[PDB]
């Protein structure tokens, strides 16, 4: 019923800078006691969520001065001084004063890097699937920034539609990068009536589509 | 060290139950409050239950959206807390968290859904290049048909990170997940390495092994 | 995204010899500088040897104590450089890196021994309500290093130890693997030491049972 914002949403910065957090309580978070019943979490890309910040301002244990926190009744800061590519995931505000206690919707931090084409590889289906009735074209782009990216898939150099999927990784924390995934999927027999299978990528570091491409059968 | 290890999660019917456990070590327990914390996947963090220590009559606490079917309990001479849930809906499908607000468990993954289990395949992703070319290589493993989440995905037992990918599974229009994990090395690595991917299905007593060689 | 992989150490006879590759990529090639570094079990960074790139006449340095026995040559169109060794000393035993001098690969371990390679032997260290237990496997009587220990596939990291090998009276290794765990999790979980010892050939998964 309390209701934690946060703002912005999203925060792209560039490492060595700072990075500030906005939190707001659609009530007061201070006790009787003086404490301010409000704490930040860090929940890094894989991990389960850890505690930077308790009660406002204290830093908890372990957690580099980098990190403070500040505020005023219902409006507060986690701020990081000097950004370092390994802060890179989702920071939480919670209150814990107010049954039920509730969780901010989550700030991600994006590490700003410079701009970094994909290197790209296209896998055929294995013998082993299509022994399966099935077959599935993979298309991975590695280590690029920014995350935008377009992935075309073709077939005889047919634009293919509706029948692809395709996920992405989280930013990285060493380099700061993205890989993405494309599955091309298609019945066998289709598999085996066309000969050239390429996947045509699109992104900001490439001064033109690059295009990744087999034959079936060599 | 403090450790708190979860455990019991999996695949259940809407309006079935599930018990689970988080087993914790690591400091005295007699006075400590826990909770749980769950995560649907992509979603934020959504608390669950407390539960206060003894002095406390081990007082419970909960939110309005598990008020009813779910029961926090805590057995002090185990240092282990528990969720009992009851009259699962699909909503609560999530990851759940045992945590005392400073440490969290790793989590453990409830699905509730009317469909069944199914055992992953998995499938070769030949290695790109050839080790004569110079240059980058890469090589994967596709984990396909499975149901539900989660797979664990390591490389040679765990001694292979550098250039691991594995990506975040997608729902097929099967209703079956599929995810691929990839790993790039230089060219010439190829045929002095050997690259097995290990497959790891919990719900349905999967494990696969695969060698993944140049074609 | 730059990758710097070397492969081919293992154990040799004194005076035998042996050829190092260090495999790289993510980069271009053709103008940059590399060395070869190593460094003995607890003992600090030695610089080895120095390869230029084409424009340079693929000029090679060496240092004191391996010239006239080593090597280093590269190949361009593998991205690849060598390292040949002739001529092994016992106290060139060491893991060997390959570098820019910014990037490094993870070393490949050469022993020189008179010893013959032995595969380990794999026990259980089996748990020791609620509170902390501890269990682990025992990786004995293995020569020579490494040997890699995981725990369910490495699937399992936290609290687990893995420590450095002693050498016994009878020349070979010993090591232990432990993980502590929260003793309720003792019967919710599997728990399976990974023990793989390449020299030997020796692939051992055991389960650690209460
Ligand atoms: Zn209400
Ligand atoms: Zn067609
Ligand atoms: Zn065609
Ligand atoms: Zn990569
Ligand atoms: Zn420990």
């Known amino acids: 019923d309390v209701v934690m914002t946060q703002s912005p949403l999203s925060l792209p910065v560039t490492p060595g800078e700072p990075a500030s957090i906005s939190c707001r309580s659609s009530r007061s978070l201070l006790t009787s006691k003086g404490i301010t019943s409000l704490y930040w979490y860090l929940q890094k890309p894989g991990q389960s969520p850890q505690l930077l910040i308790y009660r406002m301002s204290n830093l908890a244990s372990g957690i580099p001065d980098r990190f403070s926190g500040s505020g005023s009744g219902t409006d507060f800061t986690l701020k990081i001084s000097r950004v370092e590519a390994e802060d890179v995931g989702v920071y939480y505000c919670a209150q814990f004063l107010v049954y039920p206690y509730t969780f901010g919707p989550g700030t991600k931090v994006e590490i700003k890097r410079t701009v970094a084409a994909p290197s790209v590889f296209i896998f055929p289906p294995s013998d082993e699937q299509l022994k399966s009735g099935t077959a599935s074209v993979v298309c991975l782009l590695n280590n690029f920034y920014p995350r935008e990216a377009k992935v075309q898939w073709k077939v005889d150099n047919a634009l293919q539609s509706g029948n692809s999927q395709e996920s992405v990784t989280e930013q990285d924390s060493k380099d700061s990068t993205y890989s993405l995934s494309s599955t091309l999927t298609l019945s066998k027999a289709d598999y085996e009536k066309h000969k050239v299978y390429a996947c045509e990528v699109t992104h900001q570091g490439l001064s033109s589509p690059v295009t990744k491409s087999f034959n079936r059968g060599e | 060290e403090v450790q708190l290890v979860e455990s019991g999660g999996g695949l259940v019917q809407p309006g079935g139950s599930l018990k689970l456990s988080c087993?914790?070590?690591?400091?005295?327990?007699?006075?400590?409050?826990?909770?749980?914390v769950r995560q649907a996947s992509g979603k934020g963090l959504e608390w669950?239950?407390?539960?206060?220590?003894?002095?406390?009559?081990?007082?419970?606490?909960?939110?309005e959206s598990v008020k009813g079917r779910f029961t926090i309990s805590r057995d002090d001479s185990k240092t282990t807390i528990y969720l009992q849930m009851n009259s699962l809906k699909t909503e609560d499908t999530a990851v759940?968290?045992?945590?005392?607000?400073?440490?969290?468990?790793?989590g453990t993954t409830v699905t509730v859904s009317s469909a069944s289990t199914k055992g992953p395949s998995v499938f070769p992703l030949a290695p790109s290049s050839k080790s004569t070319s110079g240059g980058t290589a890469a090589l994967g493993c596709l984990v396909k048909d499975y149901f539900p989440e989660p797979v664990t995905v390591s490389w040679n037992s765990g001694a292979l990170t550098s250039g691991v990918h594995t990506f975040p599974a997608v729902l097929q229009s099967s209703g079956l997940y599929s995810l691929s994990s990839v790993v790039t090395v230089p060219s010439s690595s190829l045929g002095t390495q050997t690259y097995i991917c290990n497959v790891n299905h919990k719900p349905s007593n999967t494990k696969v092994d695969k060698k993944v060689e140049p074609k | 995204e730059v990758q710097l992989v070397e492969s081919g150490g293992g154990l040799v006879q004194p005076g035998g010899s042996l050829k190092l590759s260090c495999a790289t990529s993510?980069?271009?090639?053709?103008?940059?500088?590399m060395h070869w570094v190593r460094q003995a079990s607890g003992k600090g960074l030695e610089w080895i040897a120095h390869?230029?790139?084409?424009?340079?006449?693929?000029?090679?340095y060496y240092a004191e104590s391996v010239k006239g026995r080593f090597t280093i040559s590269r190949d361009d169109s593998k991205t690849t450089i060598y390292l040949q060794m002739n001529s092994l000393k016992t106290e060139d035993t060491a893991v060997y890196y390959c570098?820019?001098?910014?990037?490094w690969g993870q070393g490949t371990t050469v022993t020189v021994s008179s010893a013959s390679t032995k595969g380990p032997s794999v026990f259980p260290l089996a748990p020791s309500s609620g509170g902390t237990a501890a269990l682990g496997c025992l990786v004995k009587d293995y020569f020579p290093e490494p040997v890699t220990v995981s725990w369910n596939s490495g699937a399992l990291t936290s609290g687990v130890h893995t420590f450095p090998a002693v050498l016994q009276s009878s020349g070979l290794y010993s090591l232990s693997s432990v993980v502590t765990v929260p003793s309720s999790s003792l019967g919710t979980q599997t728990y399976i030491c990974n023990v793989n010892h390449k020299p030997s050939n020796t692939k051992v998964d055991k389960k650690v049972e209460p």
């Open positions: 570098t820019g001098l910014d990037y």
């Open positions: 993510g980069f271009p090639f053709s103008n940059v500088w």
């Open positions: 390869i230029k790139a084409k424009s340079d006449n693929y000029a090679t």
